[PDB]
Structure 1
Amino acid sequence: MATKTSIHPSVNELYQRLAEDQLSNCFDRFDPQEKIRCNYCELGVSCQLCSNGPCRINEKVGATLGVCGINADGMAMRYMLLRNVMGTSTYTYHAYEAYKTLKMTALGNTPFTITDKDKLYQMAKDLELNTEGKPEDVAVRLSDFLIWELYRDYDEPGKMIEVYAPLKRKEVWRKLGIYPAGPLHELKDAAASCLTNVDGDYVSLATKGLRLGLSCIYGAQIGLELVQDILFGTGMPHEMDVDLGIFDADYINIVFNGHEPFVGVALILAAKEAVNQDKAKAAGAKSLRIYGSIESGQEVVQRFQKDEVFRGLTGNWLTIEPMLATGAVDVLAMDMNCSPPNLGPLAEKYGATLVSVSRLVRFPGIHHFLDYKPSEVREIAQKIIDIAVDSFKNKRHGKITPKIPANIQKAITGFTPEAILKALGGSINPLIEVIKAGKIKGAVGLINCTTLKNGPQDYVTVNLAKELIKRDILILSGGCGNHALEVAGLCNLDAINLAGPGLSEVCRNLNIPPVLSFGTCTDTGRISLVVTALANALNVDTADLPVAVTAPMYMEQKATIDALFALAYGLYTHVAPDPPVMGAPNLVKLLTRDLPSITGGRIAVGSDPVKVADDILAHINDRRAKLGI
């Protein structure tokens, strides 16, 4: 088959239905694009930023510079920076909504509550906030402080970066001048820098990308994930069902899909009400069930158990079109990316109702717009259930043939820094000891999307993960790439049998899988808390540790902002497919060869899972040698 589909049998089966039904889909749409690809854009040496364009760099024809005078290196890095403004904006958007949700929850106006009060008070103490009064007071103070971190300008020092970053990184960041403003000012400054005839210096633009990455993790991601733990609990390991076989066509099936989990949690709470289960049964369904999709789904499976109501996680963004082709979905409730913009015709064919629950998400053919507001989420969840009941009765039941694949996989979800510490007996020391002894050679943060650019859905990701664990490298996974490993079976105890001799021994002793599900790409900051704890306990810099990062099927700039963060944080950072930079030779040299002498990190490239794994292991072994282990 010359069309890239998927490594997953469930997805390939449902692709067959999309193709038989003659519906457009991402897999088929790749092929016409292959007829007319632009290699200037592939290489990052085109520009569309002003009316003297569109420009291309081609020295052979005399087009050495753009009309404005920018060279290839500035051109490529500037467009990378501009796109990374989008990535940072999404994390900043989510953080602000989390903080407003916490405040409105403390004031009594949401269906949520303050669940992890211990985390609330410890965070407040770490940040030197006033902890007098009641938990609701402390929660308002924390929300206002974390909003201040979003809003702080380039000249007001941050506190999150001081609390949560490792000691030896701080001196590097000071030396390089990359301590950022709050993410709102940083992303505005980055966008302004990208306007024509402003910043045309590839080194400066790269520096601004590193700053933007730091602003995203310390100024948005860590705060938002800890606030979500305060609201919904801190994840601990538990068994979850994943893949598209979790659907049963005789129930009313509501799927929540995006990155922000607030609507999903409100849906689970509303679906547990007897009145709503009775509604479903009166409509001819066995009962009402809620399912998670993509990153919003992953946020929930990190913190919530499967039960008779909440059924598990469907898969990553390339599973959404196949999921509709099951003919089992009643409402797909969409809160952020990825909500692909041609779902309308598929929802129509398969008898599903599309509901946007964010002012960000719009595309042709959406049935309902219920933009999120914390004080409205209770009513939003109820209206979604009402829509789903009507949709089941009048659109799907008795009209649509279901075609649900048989595949269901088990994954242990809910790893957090706290869960790792508990699994090790309350101290990081046993992990240090198994690393020093060579049982685990090192650890990889797999923080990733999925894409079709460099293979069938999830091919590189799953095979790279298999190659890493065979080499006794423990994986901490987040993002659509985490969903892939869960569906592939790498996140359960059976997967110990795929690990090498040292890692399989540790996994059996600790009773954990060789791939630890840490959640979403938004959990890059949270994974950094584990690496920071390692660095601080060893009194070594992050750039000295036997670790690496990989985003091996990256798609969008949530992944690349996390990669820029990883570079600033001093790490070997593998990215595939190539970012659009390879036509800019001095930028390539900076990112791949010179950064180890600047931040400590570097970009690595390639899509062959075996070579990528070998190169990661070589870097880990080089770090090990310098540590004497």
Structure 2
Amino acid sequence: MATKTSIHPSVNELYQRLAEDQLSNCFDRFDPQEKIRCNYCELGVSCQLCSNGPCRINEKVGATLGVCGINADGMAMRYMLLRNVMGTSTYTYHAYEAYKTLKMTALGNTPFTITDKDKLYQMAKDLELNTEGKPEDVAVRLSDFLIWELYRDYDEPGKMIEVYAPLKRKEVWRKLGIYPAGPLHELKDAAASCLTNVDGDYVSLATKGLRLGLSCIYGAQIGLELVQDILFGTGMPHEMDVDLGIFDADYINIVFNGHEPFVGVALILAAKEAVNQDKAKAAGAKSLRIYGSIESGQEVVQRFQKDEVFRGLTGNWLTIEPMLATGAVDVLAMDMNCSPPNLGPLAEKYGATLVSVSRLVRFPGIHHFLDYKPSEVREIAQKIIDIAVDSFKNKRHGKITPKIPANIQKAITGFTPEAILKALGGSINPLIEVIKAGKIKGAVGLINCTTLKNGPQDYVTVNLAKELIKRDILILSGGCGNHALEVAGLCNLDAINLAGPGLSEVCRNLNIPPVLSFGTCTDTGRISLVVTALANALNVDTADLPVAVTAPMYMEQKATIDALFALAYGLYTHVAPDPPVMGAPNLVKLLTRDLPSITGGRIAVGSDPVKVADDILAHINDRRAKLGI
């Protein structure tokens, strides 16, 4: 087959139904695009930012510069920066909603509560906040403080970056002048820099991208993830079911899909009410069940158990169209990306009802708009159930043939920095010792999406992970790439048998898998806490550690903002497919060759799993040599 589908049997089975039903889908839509691909855009050397365009760089025809005078390096880095404003904006949006949700929870107007009170008070103490009064008082103060971090300008010093970044990185960032403003001002400044005839200097634009990455992690991601832990618990390792075989067509099936978990949690709470299970049964269903999809799903499985109501995680974004083709979904409730914009016809064909639960998410054919507000989430969740009951009765049951693949996989979800320390007996030292001894050569942060650009869904990701663990490299994973490895079975104890000799031994002694599910791409900041702990304990800089990052099937700028962060944090950062920059030679030289002398990090490229793994291992072994281990 000349059409890239998927490495996953479940998805290929459902692709077959979409094709038989003659429904458009991402896999098939790839092929027409291949007839007329623009190589200028592929290489980053086109521009559409003003009316003197559209421009292209082509020296042979005399088009060395854009009409305005910008060169290829400035052109490519500027559009990268602009797109990364979108990525930073999504993290900033999510963070603000988390903080408003914590505040309104403390004020009594949500179905949530303060669950991890120890984290709330420890964070408050680390931030030098007033901890007098009751937990609700402290939660309000924390929320307002973290909103201030979002809103801080160019000239007001941050506190989160001082608490959560390692010492030696701080001196690098001070020398380079890249301590960022809060993400709201930083993304506004970056967007303003990208307007025509403002910032046309590729070095400056790259520096602004590194600042944007730092602003996202310290100014949005770390606060939002810890606040979600305060609300919903800090994840600990537990068994979860994944893949599309978790569906049972005889139940009313509600799937929540996005990045923000608030609606999902509210749905689980509501579905556990006897009145709602009775509604489902009165409608002819066996009972009512909730399923998580993509990143919102992963947020929930990190912190919640499988039970009779919540059934597990469906898969990553390229599984959404196949998932509708099961003919088993009653409501798909969509809160952020990825909610692909041609789902309308598929929902109609397979008898599913689409519900947007964010003002961000709109596309043709959505039936219902229930935009999120914390004080309304209880009522939103109940309305979704009511919609699902009616949909089951009148759109799906007795009308739609279900086609649910048998594939279910088990994954150990819920690794957090706290889970790792517990597994090691309360200190990071045992991990340091197994690294020094060479049992584990190093560790990789796999922080990734999925795409079709460089292979069938998840092909590069899964095979690269297998090659890394064979080389005794431990993986901490987040994002759609984490869902892929979970579905592929790399996150359970059976996966120990795929690891090399040193990592297999450590995994068996600690009773952990060789791939540790750390959650979402929003958890890049949290993963940095583990790397920071290693750097602080060894008193070496992050750039000196035997680690690397890979986003090997990146799709959009949630992943690239995490890559820009990784570069600023000093790390070897592999990205595939190539970002649109390869036509800008001085920018390529900066990112791939010169950044080691600037931040310590560098971009690495390629889609061959074996070569990429060998290059990562070579970098790790170079770091090991310099450490004398």
The TM-score, its normalising length taken from structure 1, stands at 1.00
Mapped partners of 1:18, 1:466: distance in 2: 30
Shift of 1:429: 0.1
Per-residue CA deviation, residues 290-345 of structure 1 (Å, 9 max, x unaligned), is 00000000000000000000000000000000000000000000000000000000
Please state how far the C-alpha of 1:240 moved relative to its aligned partner.
0.0
Give the C-alpha shift of residue 394 in structure 1.
Answer: 0.1
The structural deviation recorded for 1:418 is 0.0
Q: What displacement does 1:162 show? A: 0.0
Task: After TM superposition, give the deviation of residue 352 of structure 1 in Å.
Answer: 0.1
Which whole-Å deviations, capped at 9, do the CAs of 1:15-34 have from their partners, x for residues lacking one?
00000000000000000000
> Cα deviation per residue 1:219-260 (whole Å; 9 max; x = unaligned)?
000000000000000000000000000000000000000000
Between the aligned partners of 2:279 and 2:558, the Cα distance in structure 1 is 39
Q: Deviations over 1:195-235 (max 9, x none)?
A: 00000000000000000000000000000000000000000
Q: Within 2, Cα distance between the matches of 1:280 and 1:16?
A: 31
The Cα shift of 1:288 comes to: 0.1
Alignment of 1:219-368 (within 5 A): 219-368=219-368
Aligned-pair distance for 1:470?
Answer: 0.1
Per-residue CA shift, 1:361-407, capped at 9, x if unaligned?
00000000000000000000000000000000000000000000000
CA distance in 1, matches of 2:564, 2:61: 34
CA distance, structure 1, for counterparts of residue 141 and residue 376 of structure 2: 23
1:573-617 CA-to-partner distances (Å, cap 9, x unmatched) read 000000000000000000000000000000000000000000000
1:420 Cα deviation from its structure 2 partner: 0.1
Corresponding residue number in structure 2 for 1:33: 33
RMSD of aligned C-alpha atoms? 0.1
Partner residue, 1:490? 490
Q: Deviations 1:529-560 (Å, cap 9, x if unpaired)?
A: 00000000000000000000000000010000
Aligned length in residues = 629
> Percent of aligned positions with the same letter in both sequences?
100
- Counterpart mapping for 1:164-203 below 5 A: 164-203=164-203
Task: Return the alpha-carbon distance in structure 2 between the equivalents of residues 420 and 136 of structure 1.
Answer: 29
Which digits, 9 at most, give the CA deviation of each residue in 1:74-122, with x for residues without a partner?
A: 0000000000000000000000000000000000000000000000000
Offset of residue 41 of structure 1: 0.1
Shift of 1:192: 0.0
- Per-residue displacement from partner, 1:484-542 (whole Å, max 9, x unpaired)? 00000000000000000000000000000000000000000000000000000000000
User: Per the alignment, in what secondary structure is the counterpart of residue 115 of structure 1?
Assistant: coil
Shift, 1:36, TM fit? 0.2
SS in 1 for 2:59: coil
* CA–CA distance in structure 1, aligned partners of residues 59 and 79 of structure 2: 20
Q: CA deviation at 1:48?
A: 0.1
Shift in Å at residue 461 of structure 1? 0.0
Shift of 1:626: 0.1
User: How far 1:475 moved relative to its partner?
Assistant: 0.0
Q: Secondary structure at the match of 1:83?
A: helix
In the TM superposition, what is the alpha-carbon distance from 1:135 to its structure 2 partner?
0.1
- State the shift of 1:566 in Å: 0.0
Q: CA deviation at 1:132?
A: 0.2
Provide the C-alpha distance between the structure 1 equivalents of 2:296 and 2:132, rounded to a whole number of angstroms: 34
Shift of 1:348: 0.1
CA distance in 2, matches of 1:355, 1:29: 24
Q: Distance in 1 between matches of 2:515 and 2:259?
A: 22
**What secondary structure does 2:583 align onto?**
coil
* Structure 1 residue 134, shift from structure 2 partner: 0.1
Cα shift at 1:3 = 0.1
Shift of 1:451: 0.0
The 4+ residue runs of structure 1 with deviation greater than 4 A are none
Which residue does 2:401 correspond to in 1? 401
Instruction: State the secondary structure of the residue aligned to 1:31.
Output: helix
Tell me by how many angstroms 1:186 deviates: 0.0
For residues 310 and 491 of structure 2, what CA distance do their matches in structure 1 show? 20
Per-residue CA deviation, residues 126-148 of structure 1 (Å, 9 max, x unaligned), is 00000000000000000000000
Structure 1 residue matching 2:61: 3-state secondary structure: coil
Cα deviation digits, residues 142-188 of structure 1 (max 9, x gap): 00000000000010000000000000000000000000000000000
Unpaired runs of 5+ residues, structure 2, are none
1:269 offset after TM fit, Å?
0.1
For the residue of structure 2 that corresponds to 1:311, the secondary structure is strand
State the alpha-carbon separation in 2 of the partners of residues 217 and 602 from structure 1.
18
C-alpha distance in 1 between matches for 2:424 and 2:160 = 26
User: How big is the shift at 1:5?
Assistant: 0.0
State how far apart, in whole Å, the 1-side matches of 2:410 and 2:113 are: 30
Shift of 1:564: 0.0
1:196 and 1:44 mapped to 2: Cα distance?
16
Structure-2 separation of matches of 1:275 and 1:512: 40
* Aligned-partner SS, 2:60: coil
Deviations along 1:439-488, one digit per CA (max 9) or x if unpaired, are 00000000000000000000000000000000000000000000000000
Question: 2:558, 2:297 → 1: CA distance?
Answer: 17
C-alpha separation in 1, matches of 2:430 and 2:581:
41
Structure 1 distance, partners of 2:70, 2:264, is 46
CA distance in 2 between counterparts of 1:556 and 1:258 reads: 15
C-alpha distance in structure 1 between counterparts of 2:158 and 2:359, whole Å:
30
Q: Deviations over 1:44-63 (max 9, x none)?
A: 00000000000000000000
Q: Distance in 1 between matches of 2:340 and 2:611?
A: 32
Q: Distance in 2 between matches of 1:484 and 1:541?
A: 31
**1:60 aligns to what SS in structure 2?**
helix
Question: Are 1:146 and 2:143 an aligned pair?
Answer: no
CA distance in 1, matches of 2:167, 2:473: 25
Is structure 2 residue 578 aligned with structure 1 residue 578?
Answer: yes
Counterpart of 1:435 in structure 2 is 435
- Secondary structure of 2:383's match? helix
2:546 corresponds in structure 1 to: 546
Structure 1 distance, partners of 2:317, 2:172, is 37
Partner Cα distance (1:328, 1:130) in 2: 50
Q: Distance in 1 between matches of 2:356 and 2:588?
A: 40
Name 1:557's counterpart in structure 2: 557
Between the aligned partners of 1:284 and 1:228, the Cα distance in structure 2 is 36
1:362 counterpart SS class = coil
**Equivalent residue for 2:80?**
80
